[PDB]
Amino acid sequence: YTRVVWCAVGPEEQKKCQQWSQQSGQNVTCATASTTDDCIVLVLKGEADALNLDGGYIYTAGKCGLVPVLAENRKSSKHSSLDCVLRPTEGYLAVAVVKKANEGLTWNSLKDKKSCHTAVDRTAGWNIPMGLIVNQTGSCAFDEFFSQSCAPGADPKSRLCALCAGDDQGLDKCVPNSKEKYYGYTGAFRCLAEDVGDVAFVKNDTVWENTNGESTADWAKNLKREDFRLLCLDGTRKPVTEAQSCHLAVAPNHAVVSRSDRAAHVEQVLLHQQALFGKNGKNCPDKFCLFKSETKNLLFNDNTECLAKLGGRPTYEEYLGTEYVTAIANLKKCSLEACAF
Ligand SMILES: *[C@@H]1O[C@H](CO)[C@@H](O[C@@H]2O[C@H](CO)[C@@H](O[C@H]3O[C@H](CO)[C@@H](O[C@@H]4O[C@H](CO)[C@@H](O[C@H]5O[C@H](CO)[C@@H](O[C@@H]6O[C@H](CO)[C@@H](O)[C@H](O)[C@@H]6O)[C@H](O)[C@@H]5O)[C@H](O)[C@@H]4O)[C@H](O)[C@@H]3O)[C@H](O)[C@H]2NC(C)=O)[C@H](O)[C@H]1NC(C)=O
Ligand SMILES: *[C@@H]1O[C@H](CO)[C@@H](O[C@@H]2O[C@H](CO)[C@@H](O[C@@H]3O[C@H](CO[C@@H]4O[C@H](CO)[C@@H](O)[C@H](O)[C@@H]4O)[C@@H](O[C@H]4O[C@H](CO)[C@@H](O)[C@H](O)[C@@H]4O)[C@H](O)[C@@H]3O)[C@H](O)[C@H]2NC(C)=O)[C@H](O)[C@H]1NC(C)=O
Ligand SMILES: *[C@@H]1O[C@H](CO)[C@@H](O[C@@H]2O[C@H](CO)[C@@H](O)[C@H](O)[C@H]2NC(C)=O)[C@H](O)[C@H]1NC(C)=O
Ligand SMILES: O[C@@H]1[C@@H](O)[C@@H](O)CO[C@H]1O
Ligand SMILES: [Fe+3]
Ligand SMILES: [Zn+2]
Ligand SMILES: [Zn+2]
């Protein structure tokens, strides 16, 4: 009843969900699916209540009647007078990142190069960069733009999956969950850091969080920001310190979605769950932290200060905004109004 079922994507999010479930005394329970779309279907059927989603999937879920409930808010210099839960969200910066040693690679010579995307259908990893490449290219042939990529969620036998590595045994190649070595903000950057790809479409925070000793993970231990460059749309290249003036787009924060008939209930539970296990919660550093998972962004991004109320009670188009929504529309013409499932 006042029990919420969360949908975890893949086995590592299951493992974090089961922990959260245990420490909450069954106030949150867990459902598991191999992909985000399956978790969305699980929520449509009423077999799960909520999951946190990237803007790209919020567009999918929203066509199917699902609604945003609460948004991730990270810590910010401006707007300091308001508390985190009531503070508006600033959204994040979609950037294209390259190795500095790879001289003369600019936005204008990205053709025939190797790319790393977070996952098909995500905002910074797919919709923004491919939306732009399609428009500039006046072609829908976005599968022939890069010579080879890792784009979790594309056909495993296509060039869009050629660069993906699967799990520790080489199984699940290209699956859009964390079992894939290069899934997600972190996998995509690792894909660039280890020189699999020439460019990685992630967000601004990903570079800061995985360089200059912020990670301690074996692949990122020795990464230095100076060794990276952002690609801007004017053909230029800039230090990772200038993301404010060299980004592809500002993306709407990931948000928790539920069925609208469940949203009031999912919201109450969550505000109390984060009072217990959020950034300053009664039981976080000591027993369990919702917003931690050693740089793996499981269920929530590791940099979430808190989950924020929305205000304006926005629909999914108001939440994502008219700019982003016409971009996904025009890109989706390539691949007719209805739920996908
Ligand atoms: C790309 O992503 C990266 C990574 O996410 C992001 O970098 C992070 O940004 C955070 C801030 O936005 C970083 O700061 C946090 O961590 C520092 C650790 O050093 C902490 O130290 C202080 O914290 C206090 C309390 O919040 C700050 O006090 C605030 O109040 C003062 C009042 O005077 C304000 O100061 C003013 O601010 C403006 C605007 O910047 C400035 O121009 C004025 O000159 C004036 O000084 C301001 O409100 C203060 O925040 C204090 O200032 C210190 O920061 C904090 O806890 C702080 O929150 C975080 O460390 C970064 N991550 C990493 C790993 O480096 C980039 O911002 C992002 N870039 C873009 C373009 O998006
Ligand atoms: C790839 O290419 C496609 C195709 O061009 C791009 O899609 C276009 O994006 C345009 C920009 O978002 C979009 O333009 C239209 O802009 C008008 C005006 O925008 C205004 O902003 C004002 C702020 O000062 C605000 O006050 C206004 O209210 C308004 O939002 C929008 O409104 C018009 O449409 C009405 C419909 O009847 C009309 O009556 C009114 O007079 C306005 O003309 C409109 O919503 C729209 O955003 C344009 O529509 C898109 N074009 C097509 C063919 O669909 C993608 O963005 C590119 N992709 C990427 C990733 O960049
Ligand atoms: C599980 O949920 C219950 C219900 O919200 C929580 O216990 C409630 O605590 C509040 C006051 O803190 C009471 O007003 C409710 O009556 C209690 N509910 C009932 C009927 O038991 C409990 O705190 C939650 N447990 C955890 C760890 O999150
Ligand atoms: O992605 C949009 C964009 O307007 C951003 O600046 C804030 O979040 C959303 O509204
Ligand atoms: Fe995202
Ligand atoms: Zn901008
Ligand atoms: Zn509205």
Ramachandran assignment for 153, one of left (phi > 0), alpha (psi -120 to 50 degrees), beta (any other): left
- Return the HEC string of 135-176: HHHCCCCCCCCCCEEECCCCCCCCHHHCCCCCCCCCCCCCCC
Q: Is 316 in the pocket of ligand 4 (CB under 6 A)?
A: no
Q: Which residues, 6 or more positions from 281, have their beta carbon under 8 angstroms from its beta carbon?
A: 274, 275, 289, 290
Q: Is 91 in the pocket of ligand 4 (CB under 6 A)?
A: yes
Query: What is the 8-class DSSP label of residue 60?
Result: H
CA of 60 to the centre of ligand 5 (A): 14
Note whether residue 332 is domain-resident: no
Measured between alpha carbons, how far apart are the two ends of the chain, in Å? 27
Note whether residue 228 is domain-resident: yes
Question: Do 299 and 6 touch, CB atoms closer than 8 A?
Answer: yes
Q: Is 93 in the pocket of ligand 1 (CB under 6 A)?
A: yes
User: Do 135 and 11 share a domain, yes or no?
Assistant: no
User: Do 36 and 128 share a domain, yes or no?
Assistant: no
User: Do 58 and 87 share a domain, yes or no?
Assistant: no
User: Do 88 and 235 share a domain, yes or no?
Assistant: yes
User: Do 250 and 110 share a domain, yes or no?
Assistant: yes
User: Do 240 and 262 share a domain, yes or no?
Assistant: no
- Return the HEC string of 284-324: CCCCCCCCCCCCCCCCCCCCCCEEECCCCCCCHHHHHCHHH
Q: Is 93 in the pocket of ligand 4 (CB under 6 A)?
A: no
Alpha-carbon span 166 to 180, nearest angstrom: 4
Q: Is 26 in the pocket of ligand 3 (CB under 6 A)?
A: no
Total number of domains constituting the chain: 2
CA of 83 to the centre of ligand 1 (A): 16
Q: What is the resolution in angstroms?
A: 2.7
Q: Which atom of ligand 1 is nearest to the CA of 244?
A: 71
Note whether residue 36 is domain-resident: yes
Q: Is 327 in the pocket of ligand 2 (CB under 6 A)?
A: yes
Query: What is the 8-class DSSP label of residue 252?
Result: P
Q: Which ligand is nearest to the CA of 22?
A: 3
Across-strand partners of 33? 9
Other Cβ atoms less than 10 A from the Cβ of 88: the count is 15
Q: Is 251 in the pocket of ligand 2 (CB under 6 A)?
A: no
Question: Do 225 and 213 touch, CB atoms closer than 8 A?
Answer: no
Ramachandran assignment for 213, one of left (phi > 0), alpha (psi -120 to 50 degrees), beta (any other): left
- Of all protein residues, the one whose alpha carbon is nearest to atom 31 of ligand 2 is 322
Please indicate if the annotation marks 261 as binding a ligand: no
Note whether residue 12 is domain-resident: yes
182: which 2 tokens? 């290069």
Q: Which residues of 167-201 are buried (b: 16+ CB within 10 A; e: fewer)?
A: beeeebbbbbbbbbbbbbbbbbbbbbbeebbbbbb
User: Do 96 and 125 share a domain, yes or no?
Assistant: yes
Please indicate if the annotation marks 124 as binding a ligand: yes
Question: Do 13 and 299 touch, CB atoms closer than 8 A?
Answer: yes
Burial class of residue 314 (count of CB atoms within 10 Å of its CB; 0-12, 13-18, 19+)? middle
Note whether residue 80 is domain-resident: yes
Q: Which residues, 6 or more positions from 36, have their beta carbon under 8 angstroms from its beta carbon?
A: 9, 51, 53, 57, 119, 121, 176, 177
Alpha-carbon span 333 to 330, nearest angstrom: 5
Q: Which of 324, 325, 326 for mutating ligand 4's site (highest number of atoms within 8 Å of CB)?
A: 324
Q: How was this structure determined?
A: X-ray
Alpha-carbon span 50 to 208, nearest angstrom: 29
Burial class of residue 207 (count of CB atoms within 10 Å of its CB; 0-12, 13-18, 19+)? buried
Note whether residue 294 is domain-resident: yes
User: Do 131 and 177 share a domain, yes or no?
Assistant: yes
Range of the domain at 64: 2-73+255-316
Please indicate if the annotation marks 185 as binding a ligand: yes
Note whether residue 56 is domain-resident: yes
Q: Which residues, 6 or more positions from 93, have their beta carbon under 8 angstroms from its beta carbon?
A: 203, 204, 243, 244, 247, 249, 250, 251
> Which backbone phi and psi does 307 adopt, to 5 degrees?
-95, 130
User: Do 260 and 161 share a domain, yes or no?
Assistant: no
CA of 223 to the centre of ligand 5 (A): 23
Alpha-carbon span 50 to 42, nearest angstrom: 9
Q: What is the CA radius of gyration of the chain?
A: 19
Alpha-carbon span 147 to 109, nearest angstrom: 12
- Going by their DSSP bridges, the two strands 50-53 and 255-259 should be labelled as antiparallel
Tokens 């790319």 correspond to 115
User: Do 248 and 153 share a domain, yes or no?
Assistant: yes
User: Do 242 and 185 share a domain, yes or no?
Assistant: yes
Q: Which atom of ligand 4 is nearest to the CA of 251?
A: 1
Give me the amino acid identity at 7.
Answer: C
Q: Which atom of ligand 1 is nearest to the CA of 214?
A: 64
User: Do 207 and 88 share a domain, yes or no?
Assistant: yes
- Going by their DSSP bridges, the two strands 148-150 and 114-117 should be labelled as parallel
Please indicate if the annotation marks 125 as binding a ligand: yes
36: which 2 tokens? 């985000």
Note whether residue 341 is domain-resident: no
Whichever domain contains 264, its CATH number is 3.40.190.10
Q: Which of 79, 122, 250 for mutating ligand 4's site (highest number of atoms within 8 Å of CB)?
A: 250
Alpha-carbon span 248 to 286, nearest angstrom: 39
Please indicate if the annotation marks 54 as binding a ligand: yes
CA of 261 to the centre of ligand 5 (A): 26
